[PDB]
Curated annotation (Swiss-Prot), chain D:
UniProt miscellaneous comment: Present with 2440 molecules/cell in log phase SD medium.
GO MF: DNA-directed RNA polymerase activity; nucleic acid binding; zinc ion binding
Organism: Saccharomyces cerevisiae (strain ATCC 204508 / S288c)
Signal peptide start and end residues: none
Residues annotated with Phosphoserine modification: S39
Organism lineage string: Eukaryota, Fungi, Dikarya, Ascomycota, Saccharomycotina
Main location, first listed in the record: nucleus
Entries under SUPFAM superfamilies matching the protein: Zinc beta-ribbon
InterPro entries xrefs: DNA-dir_RNA_pol-M_15_CS, Rpa12/Rpb9/Rpc10/TFS, Zn_ribbon_RPB9, Zn_ribbon_RPB9_C, Znf_TFIIS
GO process terms (BP): maintenance of transcriptional fidelity during transcription elongation by RNA polymerase II; RNA-templated transcription; transcription by RNA polymerase II; transcription elongation by RNA polymerase II; transcription initiation at RNA polymerase II promoter; transcription-coupled nucleotide-excision repair
Keyword terms of this UniProt record: DNA damage, DNA repair, DNA-directed RNA polymerase, Metal-binding, Nucleus, Phosphoprotein, Transcription, Zinc, Zinc-finger
Binding site for Zn(2+) 2: C74, C77, C102, C105
Top-level taxon in the UniProt lineage: Eukaryota
Protein name (Swiss-Prot/TrEMBL): DNA-directed RNA polymerase II subunit RPB9
Curated annotation (Swiss-Prot), chain E:
Task of the protein: DNA-dependent RNA polymerase catalyzes the transcription of DNA into RNA using the four ribonucleoside triphosphates as substrates. Largest and catalytic component of RNA polymerase II which synthesizes mRNA precursors and many functional non-coding RNAs. Forms the polymerase active center together with the second largest subunit. Pol II is the central component of the basal RNA polymerase II transcription machinery. During a transcription cycle, Pol II, general transcription factors and the Mediator complex assemble as the preinitiation complex (PIC) at the promoter.
Taxonomic placement: Eukaryota, Fungi, Dikarya, Ascomycota, Saccharomycotina
UniProt subunit comment: Component of the RNA polymerase II (Pol II) complex consisting of 12 subunits. Interacts with DEF1; the interaction is direct and serves to bridge RPB1 to the Elongin complex in a DNA-damaged dependent manner. Interacts with the Elongin subunit ELA1. Interacts with the Elongin subunit ELC1. Interacts with ASK10. Interacts with ESS1. Interacts with RTT103. Interacts with SHE2.
Parent-protein residues present: 1120 to 1286 of 1733
Domain notes: The C-terminal domain (CTD) serves as a platform for assembly of factors that regulate transcription initiation, elongation, termination and mRNA processing.
Top-level taxonomic group: Eukaryota
Organism: Saccharomyces cerevisiae (strain ATCC 204508 / S288c)
From Swiss-Prot, chain H:
Function statement: TFIIF is a general transcription initiation factor that binds to RNA polymerase II. Its functions include the recruitment of RNA polymerase II to the promoter bound DNA-TBP-TFIIB complex, decreasing the affinity of RNA polymerase II for non-specific DNA, allowing for the subsequent recruitment of TFIIE and TFIIH, and facilitating RNA polymerase II elongation.
Protein name: Transcription initiation factor IIF subunit beta
Keyword Transit peptide: no
Domain of life per record: Eukaryota
Subcellular location: Nucleus
Organism of this sequence: Saccharomyces cerevisiae (strain ATCC 204508 / S288c) (Baker's yeast)
Additional comment: Present with 520 molecules/cell in log phase SD medium.
Phylogenetic lineage: Eukaryota, Fungi, Dikarya, Ascomycota, Saccharomycotina
UniProtKB/Swiss-Prot annotation, chain J:
Listed name of the protein: DNA-directed RNA polymerase II subunit RPB2
Localization, UniProt: Nucleus
UniProt gene name: RPB2
Native source species: Saccharomyces cerevisiae (strain ATCC 204508 / S288c)
Miscellaneous information on this protein: The binding of ribonucleoside triphosphate to the RNA polymerase II transcribing complex probably involves a two-step mechanism. The initial binding seems to occur at the entry (E) site and involves a magnesium ion coordinated by three conserved aspartate residues of the two largest RNA Pol II subunits.
Lineage of producing organism: Eukaryota, Fungi, Dikarya, Ascomycota, Saccharomycotina
Function: DNA-dependent RNA polymerase catalyzes the transcription of DNA into RNA using the four ribonucleoside triphosphates as substrates. Second largest component of RNA polymerases II which synthesizes mRNA precursors and many functional non-coding RNAs. Proposed to contribute to the polymerase catalytic activity and forms the polymerase active center together with the largest subunit. Pol II is the central component of the basal RNA polymerase II transcription machinery.
Subunit note: Component of the RNA polymerase II (Pol II) complex consisting of 12 subunits.
Family: Belongs to the RNA polymerase beta chain family.
Amino acid sequence: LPHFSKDDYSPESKGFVENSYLRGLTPQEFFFHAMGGREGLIDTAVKTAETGYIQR
Amino acid sequence: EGLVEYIDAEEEESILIAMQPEDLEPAEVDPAKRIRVSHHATTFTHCEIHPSMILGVAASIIPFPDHNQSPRNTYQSAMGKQAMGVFLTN
Amino acid sequence: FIKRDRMRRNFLRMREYNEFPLRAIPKEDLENMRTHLLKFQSKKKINPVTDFHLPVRLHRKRKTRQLKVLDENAKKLRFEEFYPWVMEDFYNTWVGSYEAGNSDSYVLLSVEDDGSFTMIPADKVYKFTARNKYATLTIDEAEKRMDK
Amino acid sequence: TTFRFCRDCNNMLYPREDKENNRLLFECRTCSYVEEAGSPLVYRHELITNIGETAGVVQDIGSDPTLPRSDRECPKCHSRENVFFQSQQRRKDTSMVLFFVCLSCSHIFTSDQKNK
Amino acid sequence: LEPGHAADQEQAKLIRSAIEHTTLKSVTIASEIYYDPDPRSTVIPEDEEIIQLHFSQQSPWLLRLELDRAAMNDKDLTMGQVGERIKQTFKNDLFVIWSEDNDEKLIIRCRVVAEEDHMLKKIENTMLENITLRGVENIERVVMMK
Amino acid sequence: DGPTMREITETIAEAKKKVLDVTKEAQANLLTAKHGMTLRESFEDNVVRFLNEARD
Amino acid sequence: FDMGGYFIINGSEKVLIAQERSAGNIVQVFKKAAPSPISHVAEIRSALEKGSRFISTLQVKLYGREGSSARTIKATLPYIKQDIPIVIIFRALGIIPDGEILEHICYDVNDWQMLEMLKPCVEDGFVIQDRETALDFIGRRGTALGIKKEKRIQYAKDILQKEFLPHITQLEGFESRKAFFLGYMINRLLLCALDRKDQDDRDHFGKKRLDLAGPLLAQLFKTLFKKLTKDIFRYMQRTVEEAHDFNMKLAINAKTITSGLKYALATGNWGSSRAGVSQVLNRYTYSS
Amino acid sequence: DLDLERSNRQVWLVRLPMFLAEKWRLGKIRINKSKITLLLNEPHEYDLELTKKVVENEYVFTEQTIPKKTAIVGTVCHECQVMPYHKIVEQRRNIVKLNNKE
Amino acid sequence: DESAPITAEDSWAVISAFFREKGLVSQQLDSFNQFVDYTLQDIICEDSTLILEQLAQISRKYEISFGKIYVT
Amino acid sequence: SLMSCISVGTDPMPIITFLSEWGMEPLEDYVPHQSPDATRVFVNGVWHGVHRNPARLMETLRTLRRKGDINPEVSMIRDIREKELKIFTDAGRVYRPL
Ligand SMILES: [Zn+2]
Ligand SMILES: [Zn+2]
């Protein structure tokens, strides 16, 4: 993200969400969590679309 | 007067943006608040107006979306386009 | 922890030198001759026209009712003069081409015998290229030799 | 590998074997310009490429705000104000060895403790 | 593996060294071509040591190359058996020399019976790609697992 | 509870110190990767392993 | 509270959804993991800023896989069938020597790798050494409708002055500039082949351009206006050819523009090219 | 019948700013011995930089297969460029960025 | 004072001054308005001239060109 | 997103005219052996020339960009490692205020 430095290999900047759902999440973590959610939805959709063809 | 500037996705490659103004600009805890990053970076060229503006129109109706998982924010963002209400007065 | 919606009452309750002159040559000489520029492309530093020897020669080498497209002026006058010139003797060859982009603003400060100078606006500018140094070619022989 | 060009022709000088004096030469096949050889080397492939890791180093590299800042001192001028960045050669087997660039003498000193 | 030679790491290292594909390009740091007309004498001052040993009509052009000692270790190889492989590859048309394992710089030189450079460059491609030092085809990255 | 929150904060903190140590050892080129993977793959496996271990 | 921002056709509230397309006039490089002899492709979609809507795209291809020798470079040209090497095009642009070519491609004399990979192109560029033989070469390679050679050399030169790189400009004499830009594209292709730069990302949102009602109605009104002019001229030629009187009511028609705009903003198609552009406005609630 | 008149004449090429160039479409140059300026007529003085010192293979000719009358002028002696009450010129340069259409 | 740093809540005011100026759907209005303003004159002026070539045996020609467009 | 807008496109001619007044050398006069450290200038992907002082020029274009002279929809980038300076004034780009 354009909010960190370059060549940063720290775990926080690479996607680690150290906060919990009880105290909320930071923007740079909510964005990655949104990426994981959309990826989950797409993966489930593809798995179903292929599951139907396999079933037939 | 040179106090606010538009930035696309190309110029965003060559700028350093700060999230909160009064939390990352000045130089230096209750366990109920969330853990944030540090302010080791000095060359902050720009600053975010507010992070809550990254969401769209449908997700803006969600209360406390940080404490909720993303696919529920998506499902609510999809159900917000078909609820009963009053669109106009005429 | 609540949305502060009473900001209307809060805002309502809160608010050595050598000088030499320049001259413009009369426009008669500008109407007689057009000043063009010369630039060589042979890398060799010297190459004067005295070493170019003599004689130096620079010379330029039924249907019913229908439809026409159109075209403008200066572009047409530059399009009709599609014959580049060449300077040779009787052997060295130099063939020039137009530069176009290097028109813009170019003023010549020709130095005479006296310290004063004569300024002439540049009409065009051309890039001369030394042609036929090695002396060889082929056409169809190269088209058949490139098929190996 | 670091070949020369012809005079006037400016074409590349292909190597020509001199069988009379038995010595290498450099020729131009367009013309009759043949110069001597100052080295027997002609071709070097160099498979494993290690160059390009420190690519793109400019005089104005110290004014980059996106680049980080460190506090390690230079071995030459002993300046703790420097800017570090990894190798510029992008490849799978490229190591993550940092490259320190001092903001005073513009020296490039790395952080590898095994090989220097 | 076999039940008799089980729970053994060295034997599995021999099997891995017997099937894992290896090529000459794997061990090659760099190669370079030299013009050296005299077959026996070499202009290069270093390689003179090799010239002194490995010696005690041919092409004036020299093909030379250097190997990674670490590659000679990870993939167990011998400069000797390599030179054997090339000699039994091209047979007698290409004369071959190779440096010792003792040498801190691994060196290999070769010559032949228009310009000789192009011929050498062809042979370079053949050397790197078409020589397999050991192991059967289409086998890579053999992993030991308990 | 409070003490449990502090034990979680220290658990994550120890993993952060481990990722920082492996990060410094990787930047110093002092860690040789195992057979089958490169330096970056082994480093990412170590960081992800430590983060998942601290989260678990 | 009516936000507006939509159209009304036949009593229906139609909305033009924002379309998304890629940008142009930017040099791009990509890899080819297929067994094709081309390893890297340098695509660049060239088009003017306003007018005509150009689709011609230049491509600079690098032949030969990694490991094998004789990796030449050949770039395709519009209206020309087979591909042409880059050095021959440099000869057709007025640059005859090869040291100047290597001086335009590679801008660093200290680097030996790029110059080393330039060698085969300098060999084929040694085969064809003249500018006139290069213009006759491109004249004989592509576009065989010229028949005569004297018109195909000047026709090929006009191709290099007009169709070749529509951007920058299309005038005569800009061959040096286009030579520097071409050497820049070759520098990006070979510089991407040396593993010094990653493959150009297409998912970068900054390289994407959106289209609202402005661009769409610009294309539509452009084509409709062209058809209007063509029809008016057709009526003119019919009038002067059939020898009759002229009338302003029969020459300029309004149902071409009215039917074009009303039909395009009425149906989902924007003329199947494009579909689903116009959708009925969802009045389920305000946030919808 | 092309004839070289002299070519011995030395000419200096100048890249002028647009307002003064279009005005020329007289002053007095002051040569300061490695810095030279120009005192125009009332008006500004202009430092002219020695853009390119060595300037060979460049010449100047004039014109009075179709051969035409060709005459040679002189050699190019030095490549130059005129460099520039400057606030009014800066304001005019800011003012040119205000072109609009109806 | 007047030269004091702003806070996090204060930023909301800025956002207000944004939506008061633009509006939630200002991109379509600005793009459409710019289309009507400039795009019409650009399309009309970029290819307005058409000429008919008439032959007789003395040559003749005719021309039609479009100028400033008018919207109602 | 709630503060995201779409550019509309301006005119690149005044910028190109303004660059050549501060010593922007045209492209056809470029020699890589006489000016290797020259920074290339790009306007909408068109290479018009280089400049041997991108610092003061970039500062000038930024100061004049913040005062309101140049349309804020124009996005200018200065890639240091690539040694380029892209200028985008075309319509279709999505920006956000900061
Ligand atoms: Zn030659
Ligand atoms: Zn230092």
